[PDB]
Every structure is written in structure tokens, then in C-alpha cells.
Structure 1
Amino acid sequence: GLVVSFYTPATDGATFTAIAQRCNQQFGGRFTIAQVSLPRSPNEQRLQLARRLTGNDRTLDVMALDVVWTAEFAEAGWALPLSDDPAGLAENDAVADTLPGPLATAGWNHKLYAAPVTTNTQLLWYRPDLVNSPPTDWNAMIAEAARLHAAGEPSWIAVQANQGEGLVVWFNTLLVSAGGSVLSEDGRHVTLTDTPAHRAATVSALQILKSVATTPGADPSITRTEEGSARLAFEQGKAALEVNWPFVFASMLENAVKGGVPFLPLNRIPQLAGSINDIGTFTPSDEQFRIAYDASQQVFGFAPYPAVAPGQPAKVTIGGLNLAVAKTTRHRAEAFEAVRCLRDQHNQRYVSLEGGLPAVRASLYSDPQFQAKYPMHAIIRQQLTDAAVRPATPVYQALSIRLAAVLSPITEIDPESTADELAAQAQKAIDGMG
């Protein structure tokens, strides 16, 4: 029958293809979900979607939107409110058995404009064979990296943060962790330097950025403007400390079985031969997962995101993907039905245990079966409960562009003057300037 297009980031394409295919089996020919890949960066994802929307591409049906785009797509009329579902089932489905943090990312003006499908929060990953105890705050991160450098051991702090949204996320986590905020609640005012407490928080976050940037054993690519990957930098053995989203777990094991991780030769374990399936995905038995995880645990561990202040946890910036229905769709009913299928319990378990992307269904974090294959579950749920949030505003694209331009390169940050420049650029963003 008809075709419901389903646009997702390229990196997650394969995963959302599998899910889509399963859902197609459940429809029996009534309609077919067809996954289509967007570019890698959130900015480019947004740009492709917005060009199709303003161009009235009537073949665009369902969008996997980054959490930071809701506001814009809601206020422009691009993402239909879930109340526009002709069946009237979308809102109740979206809230049922769904964690409140992601739900909050999917709303605008007290209405839901998308149904959360995946969420995200950054954890600390470390080499336990080189780091005796995972650092609990950023001062300890710095000290541990310096110690590793003084010993000829891999000394990088692999943070997914170049000159784009990753750097803004890093800064936002440090800022909210110190009690600060980019914008006011209503999104109408810049709150980086408007009070002494707010300015102090901003200055603390910037000092952490500058100190990490100028720690001996730093990756020489902090000024060399490229697009390196913290995941790969850790997998190649150049970093003993990484902060990144949980999918790196699924990466480690998988690439370790493929022979791509030098310090973790899971490819040399006979019991794991053939655990990579015919399309390149690590799909172990229960026994094979036990073997792989046990071997991994000697050189690969995880821990909470490092706090900025000793004594209490960090407040970690939430990310993820919400399923929105395009205003361009010719088939609202089928599009919302597809959304409901793509986020069901089976497909949530799949998106986590095979795609590595944290699920939004609360039940799964209370599911021992799920917990056995997703060992980061407790820290993830805890950080999702106390999550930091990037400001929700229709001008988020320009705001993030300007903030990243000020923050980069982090080696040239001067906390006081940089705080003032961040405030000025954020004010330009919310004033209407991009």
C-alpha cells in the first residue's frame, strides 16, 4: 500500500531500518515504513528536514527529531501536535510507560508535538587496567590524565566535542552542574551573567573547559579543526578516559569482536567466532554476551559523569530522538500509527540492546532481562531523573552556532571575558540574528 517515509540520522539508519522492517511485518501490506537517512550532525539533520518542510515535500511523513528542535518545529507548524492524530491515540501512547525527562523534551506550550523514542545521557568510560579508580569530579579527571601522561600511558580525555553541538552540550552540562543556565525559564532572557551566582557558575564551567584543554597529554586536535571521534579515539587506545553517550558500549564489544580494538582482542576468542551476523551486527547468545562482557570489564568500565563540585552528582545534559509527524504528510493516520509501532516495547528493547540507544520506556529500566544486557541501566536512569536540559527555544540553531563559535577553540578561553562574550552572543541569538 502507501509508503510512510521515516527520516533518521544516518548513524542510526541500520537500527531504525530493522525496527521499521519489523513494524512492516505487523501491518501486513496495509502500508510500509521506509527509513531514510539524514546527515550526521544535528544541524544538518535539521537543515534537510526544514528544506523539505518549507518546500512542501508531500512524501515526508515521519521524522526522528533531535530533542533540541522541538520548539522550532512546534512553533513553525512543521511538527504536528500529537492531538492532530485522527485516531486520537497518539498523546496517550506517547505518555504511557515513558520517562518524564524525554517527555519534557518532546513538548512545547503545554502540548506534545512528538513521541519520544530514544533518549541519551553521557557517562564516563575508563580503562580500569590503567586507571585504578574512575575520577568522580573534573579536577580528578585532570589529575588522572596528567598522571597517565607522566607515565607514558595513554593520556587523552576523549570528549565528543569539537566546534559544534557536542561542545555546547559539554558546556551546558558543566554550567547546569554549577547552578547556571544559558536562558531563563521562559526562554526570553540570557542568564549567563545576569546575577553574581549565574556569572560564578558560568566562570566555573569555563575554567573547567580551559583546564581540560591545557592539561599535559592533551589531544593536539583542540586547535586543529577536524571532526575526530571520542569513541574511536578510545577504541584505538589513545585515551584512557572518555565521556560519551551509552552507544559506545555496544560499539566496544562489537568492534572488539571484529578485531578493531587492540587492547581487547575478542576476535581471538573462539567461542565468539560467528557472533557477528551476516549484516555486520554483534548478536551474541546469552553465553557469548557473558564471555564478551566479562572480558571487556578488565579494560572497559563505566561510571557516572564527573561532577563539577565534590560531594554531589553532576546534572547531565539530556539528548535523544522524538518521533514527530510532518505537516507535509498525506496520511496522518498511518503516520501516527507507524510512530506508535516504532516505539513499542519490543522495538525499544531492540533499539537499546542492538542499536545502543537508551530506551524511553520506564518499564525496561525495571526489567531484569533488559538490565542484564544493558549494564549501564541504573546510572542512565539516575542521570535521566536529574537531567540538565539545553534551552528550549525556536532560535536554538543560531544560539548554538554562536555559543560554539565563542567556546571554540577551548584553549583560548579566558573565563571572565569569555563569559561576557557568551552572554553577548546569546543575546544576539535570542534578539533575532543568525
Structure 2
Amino acid sequence: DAELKIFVSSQHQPDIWRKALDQYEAKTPGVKVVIETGGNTSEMQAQYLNTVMSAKDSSLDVLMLDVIRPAQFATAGWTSDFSKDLSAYLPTYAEANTVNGKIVALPAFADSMFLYYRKDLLDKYGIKPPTTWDELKEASKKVMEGEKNPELQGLSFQGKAIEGAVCTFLLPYWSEGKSLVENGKLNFDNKAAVDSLKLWKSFVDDGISKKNISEVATDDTRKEFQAGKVLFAVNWSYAWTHFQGKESQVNDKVGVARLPAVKGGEQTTCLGGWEFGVSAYSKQQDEAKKLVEYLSSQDVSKFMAINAALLPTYAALYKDADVTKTIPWFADALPVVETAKARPVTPRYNEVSETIRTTVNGVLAGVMTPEDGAKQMESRLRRVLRLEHH
């Protein structure tokens, strides 16, 4: 029996990972798949994979990689190219998994940030979902003033020094119609960067967000909203199944909307999602490729959507009656994914992540001013997102 080892994107829901791989094994005699986990956050996984891949570790066959990894993994030679038409998938994901024309990995699932909201609380007060951060602050004040609930947070977002905080930083910067990369080099708008960091701080200063939002990771936001302690929550699509699941206080109480804009700006969101890479160092190239073909297939995409609310990589699945029955808001989510904005495509993404996320966190922790943060950020990004000779 061949034993394939897949490094997966989450420790959570082990029974659903296993369920999916048990299906492969049943179809595929002579083949077992085991699960290896690291962190539950993309940069803790990156530290882990950097180490094993740097050592040419042959242990891992298939790697689940965040949509920001392909540039590093292709240039470092850590994946085996699919030698392959990505036209079955959303083009934004075909583009993400193509690097200098090499197919680096097959799309696993789509993701973007949405505004989760307690529609029970919005309906009670007759509030429409906010389309700008200013409307979100006015909505928060109105709901929290009437509830007189000391545990009710207006807005949960990710201020912990995690990959997610890179997403946090870029939301307002993108909304103001700015871009971080123009003609292969850093294009940095300081006013727009200062204003992003200023906006996230003002939520804390106003008491719309809790004093320790610099301690809040992706799954913190999810748990606190699930526990019924949050009005408005920036998060990804996976959180929907937890909120409608067995250990939740918000079953039937959750609406989903596009993220608000900065007043006068665009309702932009962060492109997320994950792909399946075959390790360059795998002793089992062909079996690993066959697993990835399966896990990347329309059936598994559909499985991911119905079982864990992971947004499909196949357009037709946003109009699938079973999918739309289970997650009605998926019926309208394709335009959000297909216009979601990409974090920089760069082999040195890890240094880009480190600079942005530690600035967001330090500003939210009161270690540095928005102004200082932007200057520090701009300085390190100039060295990291430079032009190379060849």
C-alpha cells in the first residue's frame, strides 16, 4: 500500500478531512492518505513548510498552500508543475496558480472576506446592512446603545500579527482605489496607508471594537460571533458552517454582506483560498498528482461547499441547487470572489506579510502611531518589492 501524506490548511473538523480522504481510498485500491497539520494560521504553516521544504524533506506528498504561496513555491522549485488547462476553474485562481506560465498547483477552494452581521439585531432596530465603515459605526452605536449589553462588541476584525492582518490593512487601502504594486515594483500611497491604520485604531478608540483587538485571530472573531457576542464580523466563508452548526448561539441569526467601503470608495474584499501542490521532494509524484486531480475535481469542490462552506473554484457550483440550498448566499457570492483584490504576487511574500501584519498589530497594541506605522511599512516594502535585474 502507498501512503500519501497531505499537509492540510486547518486542524479543525478532522472528521470532515478524513470523510473526504476515506472517499478517495475506497475509489483507489493500494493507496492510503494520512493528514499532517501545523498552525491554523497561514504564516505559522509558512514557517513550518519553509523548514521542511528547505531540508528537501520527502515526507509530505501534497501541500495545501494559501493563494499567496505560488510565487515563492515556483521560484524555490518546491512544487512539481502540472505539465495543464486551468480553464475549468475561476480565472482569478487559474492566474494565482500560474507563475512564469508554469502550473504550480491546482485550485483547492476559493475564499474572500465578508461582513457577517446579526440580522436579528439589525431587524430589531430596522437597520440596513452598512455599505461604508461610517454607516457601520452608526449601526454599531444604535444597536449597542439599545441592547445595553456590556459583552456586545460592535465590530470584530483581525488585529493579531497573523496573515489575516495583511488582509485587514489592505481593505481600506483598496477601497480608496489604491494598489500596492504597479509595473512590477511597490506603489505606496502613504495617506491611504495612514488612513487604513487610523480607521482600524478608531474602532478601538470609539469602543466599537474591544481594547484588545490586537489579540484577535481569524478563529477568535468566529468564536466570539458564534458565541453571540459580536454585531459585525470580518471573516471568511468557512465560519458560516460553525454559526449554523451544533455549538452556536447565532443559528438563523446571520446575514452576509460585502465589506463596507471607506466613504466615497469601493466595496472591495481580499482574495483568499487555497491550492493543492505536489511536493518536488515527494517519492510518489504520480500518486500525489492523482490525489490532487481528485481533490481539485468538481465533486470534491461541491463536497467542500456543502460540508464546510468553502467557496467553489467552479463557477457552475455557485448555481448548484444543493449548494444554494445549504448556503443560500453562495448564489450571489461569485461576483465578490471574481472581483476580490489579490495580495502582492512575490517570492518574498513572507517578508511582505511580516512587515504589514506587525505594523497593523503594533498600531492596534498602541506601540506606534498610524503615521510611524505607514513610514516603517513603506521603508521595508521598498526593499522587498523592488525590481530584480533578471
- Normalised by the length of structure 2, the TM-score is 0.89
Greater shift in the superposed pair: 41-50 or 395-404: 41-50
Asked if the contact 1:4–1:335 (Cα under 8 Å) also holds between the matched residues in 2, the reply is yes
Structure 2: distance between partners of 1:430 and 1:96: 30
Tell me which of 180, 183, 186 is aligned to 2:181.
183
Structure 1: distance between partners of 2:40 and 2:58: 24
Asked if the contact 1:234–1:240 (Cα under 8 Å) also holds between the matched residues in 2, the reply is yes
Asked if the contact 2:5–2:33 (Cα under 8 Å) also holds between the matched residues in 1, the reply is yes
Structure 2: distance between partners of 1:113 and 1:422: 29
Structure 2: distance between partners of 1:207 and 1:219: 16
Question: 1:356/1:369 Cα in 2 relative to 1: closer, same or farther (>3 Å)?
Answer: closer
Alignment partner of 2:121: what SS? coil
Asked if the contact 1:20–1:35 (Cα under 8 Å) also holds between the matched residues in 2, the reply is no
Greater shift in the superposed pair: 362-371 or 331-340: 362-371
What is the aligned partner in structure 1 of residue 137 from structure 2? 142
Structure 1: distance between partners of 2:374 and 2:331: 35
Cα displacement (A) at 1:316: 1.0
Instruction: Give the letter for the 2:309 counterpart.
Output: G
What is the aligned partner in structure 2 of residue 160 from structure 1? 158
Asked if the contact 1:75–1:394 (Cα under 8 Å) also holds between the matched residues in 2, the reply is yes
Asked if 1:349 corresponds to 2:302, the answer is: yes
Tell me which of 384, 392, 410 is aligned to 2:345.
392
1:306-353 deviation line (CA, Å, top 9, x unaligned): 12244x742211111100110111121111111011122221111111
Asked if 1:25 corresponds to 2:26, the answer is: yes
Cα displacement (A) at 1:185: 4.4
Cα displacement (A) at 1:416: 4.0
What is the aligned partner in structure 2 of residue 419 from structure 1? 374
Cα displacement (A) at 1:426: 1.5
Question: 1:223/1:173 Cα in 2 relative to 1: closer, same or farther (>3 Å)?
Answer: closer
Asked if the contact 1:178–1:204 (Cα under 8 Å) also holds between the matched residues in 2, the reply is no
Question: 1:329/1:155 Cα in 2 relative to 1: closer, same or farther (>3 Å)?
Answer: closer
Percent identity of equivalent pairs: 22
What is the aligned partner in structure 2 of residue 293 from structure 1? none
Structure 2: distance between partners of 1:146 and 1:322: 40
CA RMSD of aligned residues (A): 2.3
Greater shift in the superposed pair: 169-178 or 152-161: 152-161
Structure 2: distance between partners of 1:125 and 1:222: 17
Asked if 1:429 corresponds to 2:384, the answer is: yes
How many residues are treated as equivalent by the alignment?
377
Structure 2: distance between partners of 1:59 and 1:228: 29
- Normalised by the length of structure 1, the TM-score is 0.81
* Structure 1: tracts of 5 or more residues without a match: 84-90, 193-197, 265-295
Asked if 1:301 corresponds to 2:276, the answer is: no
Structure 2: distance between partners of 1:213 and 1:400: 23
What is the aligned partner in structure 1 of residue 4 from structure 2? 4
Structure 2: distance between partners of 1:231 and 1:399: 26
1:111-149 deviation line (CA, Å, top 9, x unaligned): 220100111111111112222221111111122222333
Question: 1:224/1:64 Cα in 2 relative to 1: closer, same or farther (>3 Å)?
Answer: closer
What is the aligned partner in structure 1 of residue 272 from structure 2? 319
* Structure 2: tracts of 5 or more residues without a match: none
Question: 1:414/1:59 Cα in 2 relative to 1: closer, same or farther (>3 Å)?
Answer: closer
What is the aligned partner in structure 1 of residue 327 from structure 2? 374
